[PDB]
Design a binder for this molecule. Structure first.
Ligand code: HEM
Ligand SMILES: CC1(C)[C@@H]2CC[C@@]1(C)C(=O)C2
Ligand SMILES: [K+]
Length: 405
């Protein structure tokens, strides 16, 4: 269903893209979104789907908007408008000057000194999961690795019981790829409901886990409130449960159809960090946005105050103007240009954690299970949203070709 065209939007900019169900999804998520960059399509379009919002389609405009926070505010960053109004997570729902103080604390708990201390646990979990899959000759990758590997590391780091993973994953799923069973406002309230007793517990006893450090924190030298801590801990949960989980499956789906690319990493394992960077461009998967604070002319188009604008982080690196032949994976690409981890003052805080988990996954999977493919006759289903995902990934291999380490 389409929302009526607002009077102030020129009819010739209308392109009805549905970000939660793009029309070409069967060809792949990123391919479905890349129809926005055909030569007939302008740099700035209006979709009447999902209540009606702008979409910037080129990397040049996506970067400009994310730098200019005084016109493009993160107070309402999700589409549909109801979701963006309920969205109050910290730091992303704040602009500078208020935003920067909370970043320091969030950085403190997923920052690089934390990741170095976790190296053995990351490595031993990756090996423990993979060695337990190897003699089976089959897995459901999303259930059996992509979810438990990054999510158990995050629950360990935050100090939360592993038994709570299915309830929490379902709620964060409803905030990024909704089912229809919950609105965003309801999923958010249920996740706040979960954190409220935990946060009051850990403000009593100072501690080393990520919730304690946030709940006992100061921001620009003043005590963080219980409510501010709730809104920051919830955002950490969403990042920990949704991003790497889904990115891993996209990568592994590609490697399972691309033996040429598999073989390249098997023989030259020191290409792995670079391949990580080029998989992150090709299979970029986040797309959120901003809301206009004032009437503003932007690349010839008159935006009204309160218009929402989708600024898909995913599209910048798929733009041919930023990377030649963008849909080819080329692990020796010379200048890998992308905005997979965002742009501007809201640059991703967990990218050190993310990169370690991806590189450890590629290294430990390929040395033990070098060859695998998609289970015969299965077609991989995808789902699009704020964070796009792979719905299921059946893999198979012959265990006689594996290597026990
Ligand atoms: C492949 C993995 C990941 C991707 C693609 C990714 C992507 C992004 C993007 C695009 C943004 C900017 C959104 C905006 O400007 O509105 C962001 C911000 C953020 N991310 Fe990541 N992320 C990843 C991993 C993680 C992980 C594992 C965490 C763990 C907590 C995390 C925590 C955060 C936080 C807290 C912010 C908000 C920063 C702020 O608003 O100042 N991210 N991420
Ligand atoms: C867009 C994100 C990837 C980033 C971290 C979690 C996420 C869904 C957000 O709401 C901000
Ligand atoms: K809001």
């Amino acid at each position: 269903n389409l929302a009526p065209l607002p009077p102030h939007v020129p009819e010739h900019l209308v392109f009805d893209f549905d970000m939660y169900n793009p029309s070409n999804l069967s060809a792949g998520v990123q391919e479905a979104w890349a129809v926005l960059q055909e030569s007939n399509v302008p740099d700035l379009v209006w979709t009447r789907c999902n209540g009606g919002h702008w979409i910037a389609t080129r990397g040049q405009l996506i970067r400009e908007a994310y730098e200019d926070y005084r016109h493009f505010s993160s107070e309402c960053p999700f589409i549909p408008r109801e979701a963006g109004e309920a969205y109050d997570f910290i730091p992303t729902s704040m602009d500078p000057p208020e935003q920067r103080q909370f970043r320091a604390l969030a950085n403190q708990v997923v920052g690089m000194p934390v990741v170095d201390k976790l190296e053995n646990r990351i490595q031993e979990l990756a090996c423990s999961l993979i060695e337990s899959l190897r003699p089976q000759g089959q897995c459901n990758f999303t259930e059996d690795y992509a979810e438990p590997f990054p999510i158990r590391i995050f629950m360990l780091l935050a100090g939360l019981p592993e038994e709570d993973i299915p309830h929490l994953k379902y709620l964060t799923d409803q905030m990024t790829r909704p089912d229809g069973s919950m609105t965003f406002a309801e999923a958010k309230e249920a996740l706040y409901d979960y954190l409220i007793p935990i946060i009051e517990q850990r403000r009593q006893k100072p501690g080393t886990d990520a919730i304690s450090i946030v709940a006992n924190g100061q921001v620009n030298g003043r005590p963080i409130t219980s409510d501010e801590a709730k809104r920051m801990c919830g955002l950490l949960l969403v990042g920990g449960l949704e991003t790497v989980v889904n990115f891993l499956s996209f990568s592994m789906e590609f490697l399972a159809k691309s033996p040429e690319h598999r073989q390249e990493l098997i023989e030259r394992p020191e290409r792995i960090p670079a391949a990580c960077e080029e998989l992150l461009r090709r299979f970029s998967l986040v797309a959120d946005g901003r809301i206009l604070t004032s009437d503003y002319e932007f690349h010839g188009v008159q935006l009204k105050k309160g218009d929402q604008i989708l600024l898909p982080q995913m599209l910048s690196g798929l733009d041919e103007r930023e990377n030649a032949a963008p849909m080819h994976v080329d692990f020796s690409r010379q200048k890998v240009s992308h905005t997979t981890f965002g742009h501007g003052s809201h640059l991703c805080l967990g990218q050190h954690l993310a990169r370690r988990e991806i590189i450890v996954t590629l290294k430990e999977w390929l040395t033990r299970i070098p060859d695998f493919s998609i289970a015969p006759g299965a077609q991989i289903q995808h789902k699009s949203g704020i964070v796009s995902g792979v719905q299921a990934l059946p893999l198979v291999w012959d265990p006689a070709t594996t290597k026990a380490v």
